Design a protein around this ligand. Structure first.
Ligand code: HEM
Ligand code: HEM
Ligand SMILES: CNCCc1cc(F)c(F)c(OCc2cc(C)cc(N)n2)c1
Ligand SMILES: CNCCc1cc(F)c(F)c(OCc2cc(C)cc(N)n2)c1
Ligand SMILES: C[C@H](O)[C@H](O)[C@H]1CNc2nc(N)[nH]c(=O)c2N1
Ligand SMILES: C[C@H](O)[C@H](O)[C@H]1CNc2nc(N)[nH]c(=O)c2N1
Ligand SMILES: [Zn+2]
Lengths: 419, 414
């Protein structure tokens, strides 16, 4: 009915009514909890392809209602005319178009509703680039380059999203085939090993299959593979002056820079779907700045990623014959000190996991205060190292699905019928 | 009728059918997940009609486990149970059923990473106990047996079940061996800040506290709903480990030690609708339990700052990761010390690897393995252990270990 959450480190209790506004299933039942499943539910708000009027209109009415409620109208002349406008538009085209204000509101609130995101305290400070007039892969490349340059801002990174045209019938989708705008290639070696980023071996091979000439190194920035109005995707090389990179060095270990490691500065998720009032923006790359652990814990130390732990430990002179020496744990901490020290030295925006999780607790406080709640996914919010010495580990969280939202979608190469 | 879980590190996919046998609530609803909530009346003892199907489900389950389902003995046992429930409004487990139930409450404990050992559990039947002196005796023997001079063995001692709710046996301690905590007038804390409240209850019951940093608390034992009574565990039965560091000479000078035996004593064991309110159980420690939570939680011994200082760490900015660095060294020390003293302990890498092997076997032979990711993933270095990348389904099977209200919140003093 009305659910409370407690922090066990501070005893603060917060009361949640916002969850009553949730629409989509979490995947859980009274009998099974799916909170650690990556993709627990397939409960979509609209059917397969182009929906009928009685399917799309009720979703549209909900979002318009919420937007006009947001700005202290509801029932105002502009609201009631907007409903009639959307109504006639679905009648004559089977879809509708968002005003600039509604589009910005929807993007910002999909970020606000992103239960898995620890960075949401900045949710209302998002730059929205309307790219809905785009018609070709070349135009998409231009929009994406402007996005990257604006968001990088010479190291003082800025949150931004660029929104390409919504889905119509499902055959004219706009898609960025890259999962992130900037990633490193991954190469399947003949001796079975892997050079570069193993996560991207398959996408790297699609690029080569499309004509990309791989330099075959450890940190090869992948090309963009852009799809517009359902046509075959096209390759573009991001101008390197636009790809800001931080060489990784360590403030005490002088031998660290000799590892020859660097990472890119801009994290830009480009494979997700943005859902606003029943409309589906299948290409909506968004970016912010890194939490240190994303690079130094997951990108470098995951077994199926760069996996540098052994090397860093060996250089550190660590006993690697037994787990109980905690050599992995020791190297892991040093790598993350190095990542943070390098980014801060080159004046590139980065946030450590202590600061980020502390900010999120504050964001929670504000949201329960003004909004009646904040959906949060503990399994994702807690950092992947030193969990219990950050304040979120000790914070109970309720998870529920609010719209507008970011959703996953299939990879286009499982879907796309070439020509 | 199927559910699949995937490992995102290995790509292994398992299929859970066992969740169809769950019958009690997770706390989640179809529209909101309560997976991170920690806890989603005395007269609430079960009626005759409530007890009938619970008992049947468990007896059926037990005879299925021993390949005698439907058999003559299964049907007469069923008849025998339903007779007792008619006459007495309760029933009594056979010894075999008690051992099976205690083992399967551990097997079903979704928050326990240590369940690879569930079938090797020593069950001490203390259902004939009637006084707190009797409970003291049972518990001392448990401690001595489980400690085994540092070669720890898992065990549980089961006291008489709940009857009307007015005659409960309880161990008032939360664990069998914990250190006392004392608030000072200046607001500081001596010992373990977790146990300040319980230390005060003991002091008020007559305990004369040494007022030191590592005073083993006395046992506070309640038999048959009477007022609880104090007893001092004989100090020769409490194995302890001084914490030193293999590289840092100065670490021993912190004066740190910990007990060898983790023995949870505040939970309720539920078998076939019967409720065993006093059922202390014990295993051996995973290092991070002591190194991360016990020593470094801000609400606990809180020695991160002290260790970082002796490490010459820059503690001006969080981004130096001085807290992280100090946490690893403490956990190195905890493991080194227990191993040097040949006191059983398990590090989080070994423990989580074993649990993945356990989980896969449980999917093989049982159709699943209920698991609570929020508890199974260790409190440090989470993503470099294999459970972090393992999807898990959480659901509640019985027999089960349950939380219960603290006894001083509900006891009716005589
Ligand atoms: C500005 C600084 C930001 C920080 C520090 C941050 C931090 C994070 C982190 C650490 C994760 C988990 C990633 C992982 O470990 O795999 C995450 C997830 C996510 N972030 Fe943020 N983020 C930021 C900005 C944004 C922005 C601008 C958006 C959208 C406009 C956004 C939307 C999301 C979404 C939708 C997810 C979860 C998606 C999924 O389920 O995979 N974030 N964030
Ligand atoms: C033998 C070695 C064992 C290991 C290494 C082990 C490890 C753990 C750990 C690390 C936890 C989480 C503790 C925390 O962080 O608060 C836990 C929880 C638990 N253990 Fe085990 N354990 C062991 C034995 C046992 C035994 C013998 C039993 C019962 C017979 C048991 C029942 C439980 C239960 C019921 C919980 C969770 C209670 C709850 O909060 O729901 N464990 N275990
Ligand atoms: C194994 N991890 C999965 C990787 C992953 C998958 C997603 F689907 C995300 F959405 C994501 O977001 C990461 C992110 C996004 C932004 C905008 C800023 C920031 N610092 N980090 C990360
Ligand atoms: C600090 N978190 C809360 C503490 C806590 C709460 C519980 F409800 C437990 F059940 C528990 O069990 C800890 C345990 C038990 C056994 C038998 C072995 C072992 N190694 N650890 C610990
Ligand atoms: C709020 C949150 O669920 C709580 O802090 C949990 C998180 N996970 C945990 N995991 C374990 N093993 N032990 C704990 O005490 C906790 N505490
Ligand atoms: C199985 C598990 O759900 C999966 O490995 C999750 C766990 N938590 C995570 N948390 C974050 N931030 N990012 C992730 O990719 C994951 N992966
Ligand atoms: Zn759930």
């Amino acid at each position: 009915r009305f659910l409370k959450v407690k922090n066990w480190e501070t005893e603060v209790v917060l009361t949640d009514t916002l969850h009553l506004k949730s629409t989509l299933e979490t995947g859980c039942t009274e009998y099974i909890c799916m909170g650690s499943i990556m993709h627990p539910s397939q409960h979509a708000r609209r059917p397969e392809d182009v929906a009928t009027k009685d399917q799309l209109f009720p979703l549209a009415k909900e979002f318009i209602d919420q937007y006009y409620s947001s700005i202290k109208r509801f029932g105002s002349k502009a609201h009631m005319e907007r409903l009639e406008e959307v109504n006639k538009e679905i009648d004559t085209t089977s879809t509708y178009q968002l005003k600039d204000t509604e589009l910005i509101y929807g993007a910002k609130h999909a970020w606000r509703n992103a239960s898995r995101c620890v960075g949401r305290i900045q949710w209302s400070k998002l730059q929205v680039f309307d790219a809905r007039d785009c018609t070709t892969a070349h135009g998409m490349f231009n929009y994406i380059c402007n996005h990257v340059k604006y968001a990088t801002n010479k190291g003082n990174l800025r949150s931004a999203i660029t929104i390409f045209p919504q889905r119509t019938d499902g055959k004219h989708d706009f898609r960025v085939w890259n999962s992130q705008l900037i990633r490193y290639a991954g190469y399947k070696q003949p001796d079975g090993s892997t050079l570069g980023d193993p996560a991207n071996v398959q996408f790297t091979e699609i690029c080569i299959q499309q004509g990309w000439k791989p330099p075959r190194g450890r940190f090869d920035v992948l090309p963009l593979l852009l799809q517009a109005n359902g046509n075959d995707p096209e390759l573009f090389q991001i101008p390197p002056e636009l790809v800001l990179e931080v060489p990784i060095r360590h403030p005490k270990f002088e031998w660290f820079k000799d590892l020859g490691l660097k990472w890119y500065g801009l994290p830009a998720v480009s494979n997700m779907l943005l859902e606003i009032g029943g409309l589906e923006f299948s290409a909506c790359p968004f970016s912010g700045w890194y939490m240190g652990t994303e690079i130094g814990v997951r990108d470098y130390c995951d077994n199926s990623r760069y996996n540098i732990l052994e090397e860093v430990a060996k250089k550190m002179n660590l006993d690697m014959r037994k787990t109980s020496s905690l050599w992995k744990d020791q190297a892991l901490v040093e790598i993350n000190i190095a990542v943070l020290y390098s980014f801060q030295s080159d004046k590139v925006t980065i946030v450590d996991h202590h600061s980020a999780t502390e900010s999120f607790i504050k964001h929670m406080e504000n949201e329960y205060r003004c909004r009646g709640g904040c959906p949060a996914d503990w399994v994702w919010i807690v950092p992947p190292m030193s969990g219990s010495i950050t304040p979120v580990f000790h914070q109970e969280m309720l998870n529920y699905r609010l719209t507008p939202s970011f959703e996953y979608q299939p990879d286009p190469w499982n879907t796309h019928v070439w020509k």
